[PDB]
Design a protein around this nucleic acid. Structure first.
Lengths: 259, 257
DNA sequence: TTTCATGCATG
DNA sequence: TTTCATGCATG
C-alpha cells in the first residue's frame, strides 16, 4: 500500500531504518594470496586538507561502525579523493590495484543477466526488486587477512595516527563481487526451498522475486525481507521495487515485454 | 550431548570462535573532566616472565584484539604465576586508568538477590556461561589509547605500545558495560518467550523453564539467539535442561546448595 | 565526462 | 609468445 507500511513492518531489513547490515551466518573470509606475493606498500599521494575533510565524514561513519579499524601492516594502497564534477561532493576510492595483482584470482560464477531473467516463466508476473545497500561491508574479513587493504589515514581527533584497514569486504577488491554473490546464494539457499512457488533471482547484491499473484508476491516479499533481516543483510528502501507488475532489474525491464 | 555441539555452530564458542556483538557499536570511554593521560613506567621482566607471557599476546595480535600504538597512556603488565613448571596470565594494572575514567552507576545485580525470584514452577534449568564475553564488545579507536601497554618485540615487529580493541579485562566498567549490553540485546528474546525465565549476571546465564520439553525450545531459541547476536558460550561447561544444576556458586534442585 | 592512475580494448 | 595511441571504465 504505502512504502512506509513495508518500512515500519520490517525495520530490521531496511538499511535506512534498521542499522548497518552484517552477515551473521557468514564466517570471516580469508584472502588467499598468490603462491609468491609479498607485502607491497604504495604511498599516499599528497592530499589537500581541503579535500581530506571533504572525505573525512566518509571514513568517520566507517570508523564508528568498526568497519574501518586501526592497524599497522606492510601493505598500503592510495586513497583517492574523488570529487563529483562541479560540486565539493567528495568521496574516497581506494586504489586496491596492487594488492589485487598479488591476491590469487577467483573464477566468477555470476549468472549472466539476460539468460537468468529469460528462464522466468509467464506464470510468475509479479515482481519485487531489492538491492542490499553496502553488500560487501556485510562480510567479515578474517583477522589474519585485513592487513592487505590498509590505507594511510591520520586523525588525532579519532585516535588514528597511521593507517586503517578493513574488517569487511572493501569495494574495489576484485574477488568482492564473486565472494558476496556466493555467500548470499548460500544464505538464501533455505529461503528458496521454503517457497517452492516463488522464483528467487540474485546477481550479487541485486534481488528479484516473482510470484503468480500480487498476494503471493506480497507474502513472498515479507518472508523475503524478514529472511534478510535476521540474516544480517539490509535492503535499500529508497530504491525498493515492491510487488509491482513491472520493474527494472539489471538495466533490464520486465511485465509483458522487455527493454 | 553430542547434538548441541553440531546443531548450533554460532551459538557455542567451540564451533563459532571468538564472539562479537553485531548489534553493539565500538564504545567511547568518557574520561573524568580533570583526567589527563598517565605514563606509569613498565616494571622490567625476567626472560622467563617475558617467555611464558609471550604466546599470550601473540594469540592476541593475530586475532586482532591488540594493535600497536604510540599512546601517552601506559599501564604496567604484571607476570602472573600459578603452581608446576611455568604457568602465567597477563594482568594489566589498569587501576590508574580506572581512576581517571568516568565511572558508571552499577547495573549489575546482587548474586543472591537474583536467584531469589526463581519460581518453583520452573524446575527445569539450563546454565550456559558465555566465553570471552567482553571481547564480544569492542572499543572505539578513540578510547583505545587509555589501555595501551609496553611490548618491544621483533617476533611480531613491535617497538611501541599495544592497546585494546575490545572491552579489556581489568577495566572498572567492563562488567557493567557487558551485562548492560547483553541485557540490551537479549530484550526481545524475553518478550518472545514470556513463559521462560531468563537470568543474566554479566557473562553467566540461567534459563528456567517449567517442563523438560519447554526447557528444550527455550535453550534452542536461546543458543539460536546467542549466535546471530555474536555471542559464543562454552558448550563444554554448558548444563542443558537439567533438574539439578549449579549457577553462580549456588546449586539448584528444589531449595539450593 | 574529476585534485590521480591506468589496464584494456579499440581504431 | 606483441606492434603504436588513446578514450573510458574502474581502482
Amino acid at each position: 500500500g504505502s512504502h512506509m507500511t513495508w518500512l515500519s513492518d520490517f525495520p530490521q531489513a531496511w538499511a535506512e531504518t534498521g542499522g548497518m547490515g552484517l552477515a551473521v551466518r557468514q564466517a570471516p573470509l580469508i584472502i588467499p594470496l598468490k603462491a609468491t606475493s609479498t607485502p607491497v606498500s604504495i604511498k599516499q599521494y599528497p592530499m589537500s586538507q581541503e579535500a581530506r575533510l571533504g572525505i573525512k565524514p566518509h571514513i568517520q561513519r566507517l570508523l564508528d561502525q568498526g568497519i574501518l579499524v586501526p592497524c599497522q601492516s606492510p601493505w598500503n594502497t592510495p586513497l583517492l579523493p574523488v570529487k563529483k564534477p562541479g560540486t565539493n561532493d567528495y568521496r574516497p576510492v581506494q586504489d586496491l590495484r596492487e594488492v589485487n595483482k598479488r591476491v590469487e584470482d577467483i573464477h566468477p560464477t555470476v549468472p549472466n543477466p539476460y539468460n537468468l531473467l529469460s528462464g522466468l516463466p509467464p506464470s510468475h508476473q509479479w515482481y519485487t526488486v531489492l538491492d542490499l545497500k553496502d553488500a560487501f561491508f556485510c562480510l567479515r574479513l578474517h583477522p589474519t587477512s585485513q592487513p592487505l587493504f590498509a590505507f594511510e589515514w591520520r586523525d588525532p581527533e579519532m585516535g588514528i595516527s597511521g593507517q586503517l584497514t578493513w574488517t569487511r569486504l572493501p569495494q574495489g577488491f576484485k574477488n568482492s563481487p564473486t565472494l558476496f554473490d556466493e555467500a548470499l546464494h548460500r544464505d538464501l539457499a533455505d529461503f528458496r526451498i521454503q517457497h517452492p512457488d516463488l522464483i528467487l533471482l540474485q546477481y550479487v547484491d541485486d534481488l528479484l522475486l516473482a510470484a503468480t499473484s500480487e498476494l503471493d508476491c506480497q507474502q513472498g516479499t515479507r518472508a523475503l525481507l524478514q529472511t534478510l533481516g535476521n540474516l544480517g543483510y539490509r535492503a535499500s528502501a529508497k530504491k525498493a521495487q515492491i510487488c509491482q507488475k513491472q520493474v527494472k532489474y539489471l538495466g533490464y525491464l520486465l511485465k509483458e515485454g522487455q527493454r
